[model samples]
Target: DAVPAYPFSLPHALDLDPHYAELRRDEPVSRVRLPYGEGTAWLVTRMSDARIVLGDSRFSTAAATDPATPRMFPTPPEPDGVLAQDPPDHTRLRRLVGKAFTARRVEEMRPRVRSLVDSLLDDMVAHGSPADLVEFLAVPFPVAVICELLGVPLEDRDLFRTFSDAMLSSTRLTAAEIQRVQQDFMVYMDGLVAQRRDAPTEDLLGALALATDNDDHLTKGEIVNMGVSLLIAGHETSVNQITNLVHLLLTERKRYESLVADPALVPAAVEEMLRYTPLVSAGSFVRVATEDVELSTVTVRAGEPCVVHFASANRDEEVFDHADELDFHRERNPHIAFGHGAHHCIGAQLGRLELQEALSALVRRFPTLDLAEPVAGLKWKQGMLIRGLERQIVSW
Candidate 1:
């Protein structure tokens, strides 16, 4: 049996890699080797089984930190951090975070989020046509929203821009280089959290620092890790995500034009883009099955790493009729873009809020907005875990 190498290159980052479709239909569960991981891992392809792996308690995330475990990064995050912690601890931490970043909080920010998008576009237009959207609007909008919510110093944006990009790289950076950024981020967050604990304030971190349930105060380590996790989720991913949505809409100009023609489509349009866009660039999911488990197509023994392709599952043929086509009218659009189960993205609502506001404001403001250059001329970011354009040049 030959194992294919994981994450083959494609012409456009927006194009769903054809290989994932092949595996989903023919071999829902298959094995493959990754560039930075240990040997091979079982790849879960279709949505049916992808959900199982994502939600199943037997698929232990905490176990994934073993030195020999397969992963996309140079090394897995330290155990007990929000991403790696198992049941009770993850549940406890998630509870504290939920209280801080509530639905109402995101709803309240709509006016502010919408205003920022418009402000960025206003600045972008002043700078002149053929302005790079990624540099101007896409990057700063999300960075500002996430920073304000988390109560992190906005002056630190420049440092974070470098650190965040480095932390998500796979092949473009060396292990030492990646670790250097992560360590620096941890130290920065440590100092920030320490400072936060002293003064009384009313930001997300404020709620976290003071959160207690009788005898349970979130430990300093938990607070620090959660702070880092929220920062990365709220800032880095959202930055590229804003660009990804714009690129998707402009790639097929009617998609943008449709929203321009009719404002009502704005709500469904962003959800469609979330379903259509490719975010995870490589093997992010690595769970060690603690015991024998039966998947839709195969049986897995205990203690082996399995990587679920959420990007693949988003395009699952059985689940989504005409999975490849961009349809804004998708009523039952249930995507694991933010993921599923316990560790599902804490910033899902906030991410959607930013996307909705930005996407709506972009098309409404500039009906003629589109790629300044043809798709072939537009470069993309390679060797990074999340997929986005290098420079999204645009004119209205």
Candidate 2:
């Protein structure tokens, strides 16, 4: 029997159909096959269940020499990054990097992030006529801010961008293709590590590189992998977010104008934007059950993969009132856009800072910012972990 594997990159099919009502109604925890994996994995569609599944330790995220366990992706989903680890490795690594991305530090970087926003807007204005939001403002702002924080040079962003694009295109390629990209990535990272070792600066890389000397828990290789993971996760997710945020604003003029009228609404607007149009179309934490577990009616056996649907859960009618409707000021929102529990996004604070600074500055500088072409006209880069409108033509 073939377990149907939904093509996640498709804009509107299984995921968007009935606002995930099908998943919730048909099978809250159902079976779905993934590439190179046999049998069906449990798909958690409800908000409460998804949260519980993620937070609970019984379901393991690790893949250490177990043939029965389902691999989240093909071998080396990411080669020894934070995402792949379970506690105390996850706990230790999370604690270390978590301190750097705290609320206070991110807030302190607001002015610098603002300056970046202003600079990008200036470039957009200089370009004058038709311009792509992503090329001018959306892409560079986050990359530059992250580079500034991590002390990666602005010129080197293009190199990271190329690697990230190749890595994210997993659906179209076999595991071999992705491994090739990761191997190349490791080579490039090794070069960066060598450069940092010789001539150090006060960047994330420098901090991690030096961290090994201070703490026995972390090694130089772990530091490099962590840095690369954070950098890739940071910019790639933010790029998609910024692009998607602008797209939402343009498509929904009323929501767009509400922010225009009240600048204070930027923060709330950003949150609601996340709720209404989350960047990820579909993805789940691939977990393996330690024992027999019953979610709703489905019996998930020990050592079977359980995929929690955060996207579907975020839009669950029971959790979010009028969930389908796009209300910019929906208070008491506890969406899973950043995910939940132990594996929640490490860069949540930084993402919020970048979004607030960039969006607020864009709206303030160009009050008349609107899409020059129809939403349909914009091209979307396909077959990636993150969903993004590649380019959106716009003018003030």
Best candidate, lDDT-wise? Answer: 1
Worst 10 residues of 2 by lDDT: 6-15
In candidate 1, what are the lDDT values of residues 358-394, reduced to their tens digit? Answer: 8788777789887888787777888788888778888
Name model 2 segments beyond 4 Å from true: 13-15, 64-75
lDDT of 2 by residue, 117-189 (tens): 8877888888895798889977898889878777777899878888777777636566777778777777777
lDDT of 2: 0.73
Error at 45, model 1, angstroms = 1.2
Candidate 2 versus the native: TM-score?
Answer: 0.93
**Residue 131 lDDT in model 2?**
90
Candidate 1 residue spans exceeding 4 A from truth: 9-11, 211-217
